[PDB]
Write a protein that binds this ligand. Structure first.
Ligand SMILES: CC(C)=CCC/C(C)=C/CC/C(C)=C/COP(=O)(O)OP(=O)(O)O
Ligand SMILES: [Zn+2]
Lengths: 4, 407, 323
């Protein structure tokens, strides 16, 4: 996952 | 009965939930099988050791990890040097979920730190001197609201914040993440979250936004980052949550969305995957499972008569089992899956997801499911903002005292 | 010039050509929270970056410094922004910059800034000629890289490079028929070219999907695609579908086949089908089998579907209370  | 196993993942029949690769091996099946084998070992560990399983949320351990991290981090966190308000938010929220008080010394220090991150032109950056960006702006606002003091609320320059949001708004309804930055559904949610909490929503701020978000829903039922892209839990949470804030959930085909998210829970592992045919991951305990409380409220607002009055539309028990048995680091902190290293992001989201799974609320109706020892119960979290419902109420009420910038 | 990992790499504070500049230490305040104990190399580069940024020094040395700041934290969007300012001010060769971004993305493909930077470059140059091949190389290392697929859709759509994409999709589906990103790309290509209204296309698609389903009955992607392309017009609108699915029941069952049957019944009942009664029962029976045996992880969903169908399709559903 990643977010920014 | 005596032969009955109370833990769902440990029942004999649970073994039937293992992957059936149809004797056609592909990268996807191979990867999925590896995870399941690793997780089966975790499930079987009690049996092979001849011990009675006891699911304990390691509170003291998680607390130590959090309290220290709130002050200092190793260079392992250099990759998050442009995301410090997120570190503040992830940690403070984790502490809030664990019902650990935030010392006034800490609270004031966070406030001052976030001020340093606030841009002269609105919004917050990833650290002092960095340009503002919607992701750390969302995190900073949430962190300040968790603190919830007058000081915390006063940090936010509301006029400049609104100016900032307008400078990012696009004609098609979307928002850039930052000046000269990328566009995807995260921006819509970040803007809506901060604008609603601070009461700075003008009549045209979100014009076309609900429509832009609706265009992101694809053939799968979920929502992708931008129109045309694969449905993903992170983006779906962002899309639905933003639509809930804008009171336009109806723009979506809630039915295909519900079918999609429920299908994201892994039959064997019990946790959620981010997209179809990928792997389980503890942070989706929030991004994916958090959609159920949102859908429940949306469908109930439409008068849906078939809605349960005691559970969310996902296996609450199995998610808690996955988190408690597979996502806890012995030294403190939570994780993606066994074999992964702990981090504050997964600590925040595994806990958030655990809270969601433990608490069902629908107006006057309230029902809990707390797997393992009773001390495992966490404080509830708001499904839209992912901060305490009390913090949401307190903040909104406070900001409603101020007039929307411009008057 | 001097790589960040070069054995002879020297801190900026020890570089003569940087002696005129006073580095600017990070302003964390009197009592820091979430303070990162940066390594020497990191803090040194960033103290110098803070200096050039603060004085807005648009120079070649500032340009080279951003490369190091980026290698230290490729997620630092402020550095990427300044770098783009420098590319324009210094009139830097953009193909050389494309070579640079290609290498950076190859090493850190799950990063938002690198893909956005490449996009800006392509836009500036109005040249998509290296895109499909570049992306294909990344997808060859991670066939599901989200940013890669998103960039690919943008390039294809913006520059109308649709001609060979379905062939590419077929290739990847052959490598891994379970790759959901490829099924999504398949839908993307078809809906933006021929569309699915064309009966010959729809027919072809369903034949293909049903064939994939036979080969790997438990691959959820083929199932979602099949439902994805037919659910819009309404599943009941296709009478042969149901029969054909029941035919797989014996030697190709899965919670998917059963779930689909429920979707067909659900729509049939929605479009006032014959034997409303018989259909509803068949459906509630499958919902029970699913919630109780074949798909218990989704028991709350299946129970809800069962209650929903019952709630509006039971023979009593239209009968007034007094009767
Ligand atoms: C407010 C805010 C910033 C929300 C962010 C939500 C979120 C988690 C988005 C994920 C985006 C993404 C590209 C995931 C794919 O990474 P991956 O391929 O490594 O993960 P995967 O295999 O689980 O899809
Ligand atoms: Zn994760």
């Amino acid at each position: 996952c990643v977010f920014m | 009965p005596v032969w009955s196993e109370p833990l769902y993942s440990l029942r004999p029949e649970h073994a039937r939930e293992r992957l059936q690769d149809d004797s056609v091996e592909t990268v996807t099946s191979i990867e999925q099988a590896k995870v399941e084998e690793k997780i089966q070992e975790v499930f079987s560990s009690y049996k092979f050791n001849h011990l009675v399983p006891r699911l304990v949320l390691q509170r003291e351990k998680h607390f130590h990890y959090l309290k220290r991290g709130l002050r200092q981090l190793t260079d392992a966190y250099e990759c998050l040097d442009a995301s410090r308000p997120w570190l503040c938010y992830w940690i403070l929220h984790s502490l809030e979920l664990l019902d650990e008080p935030i010392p006034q010394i800490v609270a004031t220090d966070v406030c001052q730190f976030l001020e340093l991150c606030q841009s002269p032109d609105g919004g917050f950056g990833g650290g002092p001197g960095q340009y503002p960006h919607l992701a750390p702006t969302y995190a900073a606002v949430n962190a300040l609201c968790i603190i919830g003091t007058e000081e915390a609320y006063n940090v936010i320059n509301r006029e400049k914040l609104l100016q900032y949001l307008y400078s990012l708004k696009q004609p098609d309804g979307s928002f850039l993440m930052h000046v000269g930055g990328e566009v995807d559904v995260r921006s819509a949610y970040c803007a809506a979250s901060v604008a609603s909490l601070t009461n700075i929503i003008t009549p045209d701020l979100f014009e076309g936004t609900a429509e832009w978000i609706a265009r992101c829903q694809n053939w799968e039922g979920g929502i992708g980052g931008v129109p045309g892209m694969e449905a993903h839990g992170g983006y779906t949470f962002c899309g639905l949550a933003a639509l809930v804030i804008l009171k336009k959930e109806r723009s979506l085909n809630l039915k295909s969305l519900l079918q999609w998210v429920t299908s994201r829970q892994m039959r064997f592992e019990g946790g959620f995957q981010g997209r179809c045919n990928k792997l389980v991951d503890g942070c989706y305990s929030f991004w994916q499972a958090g959609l159920l409380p949102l859908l429940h409220r949306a469908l109930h607002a439409q008068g849906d008569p078939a809605l349960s009055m005691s559970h969310w539309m996902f296996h609450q028990q199995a998610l808690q089992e996955y988190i408690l048995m597979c996502c806890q680091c012995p030294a403190g902190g939570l994780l993606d899956k066994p074999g992964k290293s702990r981090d504050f992001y997964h600590t925040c989201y595994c806990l958030s997801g655990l809270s969601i799974a433990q608490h069902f609320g629908s107006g006057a109706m309230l029902h809990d499911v707390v797997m393992g020892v009773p001390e495992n119960v966490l404080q509830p979290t708001h499904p839209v903002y992912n901060i305490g419902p009390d913090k949401v109420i307190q903040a909104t009420t406070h900001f409603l005292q101020k007039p929307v910038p411009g008057f | 010039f001097l790589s960040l990992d070069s054995p002879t790499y020297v801190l900026y504070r020890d570089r003569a050509e940087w002696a005129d500049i006073d580095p600017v230490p990070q302003n964390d305040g009197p009592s820091p929270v979430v303070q990162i104990i940066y390594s020497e190399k990191f803090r040194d580069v960033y103290d110098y970056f803070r200096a050039v940024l603060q004085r807005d020094e648009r120079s070649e040395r500032a340009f080279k410094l951003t490369r190091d700041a980026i290698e230290l934290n490729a997620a630092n969007y402020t550095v990427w922004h300044f770098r783009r300012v420098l590319l324009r001010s210094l009139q830097k060769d953009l193909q050389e910059e494309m070579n640079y971004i290609i290498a950076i993305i190859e090493e850190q493909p799950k990063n938002y800034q690198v893909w956005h930077h490449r996009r800006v470059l392509v836009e500036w140059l109005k040249d998509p000629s290296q895109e499909l091949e570049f992306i294909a190389d990344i997808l060859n290392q991670d066939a599901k890289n989200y940013h890669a697929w998103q960039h690919r859709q943008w390039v294809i759509q913006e520059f109308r490079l649709w001609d060979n994409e379905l062939q590419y999709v077929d290739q990847l589906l052959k490598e891994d028929v379970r790759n959901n990103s490829v099924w999504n790309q398949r839908h993307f290509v078809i809906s933006n070219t021929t569309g699915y209204s064309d009966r010959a296309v729809l027919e072809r698609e369903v034949q293909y999907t049903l064939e994939m389903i036979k080969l790997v009955p438990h691959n959820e992607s083929a199932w979602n695609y099949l439902k994805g392309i037919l659910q819009d017009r309404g599943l009941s609108r296709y009478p042969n579908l149901l029969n054909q699915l029941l035919d797989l029941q014996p030697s190709h069952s899965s919670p998917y086949l059963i779930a689909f049957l429920v979707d067909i019944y659900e729509d049939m009942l929605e479009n006032q089908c014959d034997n409303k009664e018989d259909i509803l029962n068949k459906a509630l029976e499958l919902c029970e089998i699913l919630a109780k045996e074949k798909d218990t992880i989704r028991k709350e969903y299946w129970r809800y579907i069962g209650r929903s169908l019952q709630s509006k399709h039971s023979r009593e559903s239209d009968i007034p209370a007094s009767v």
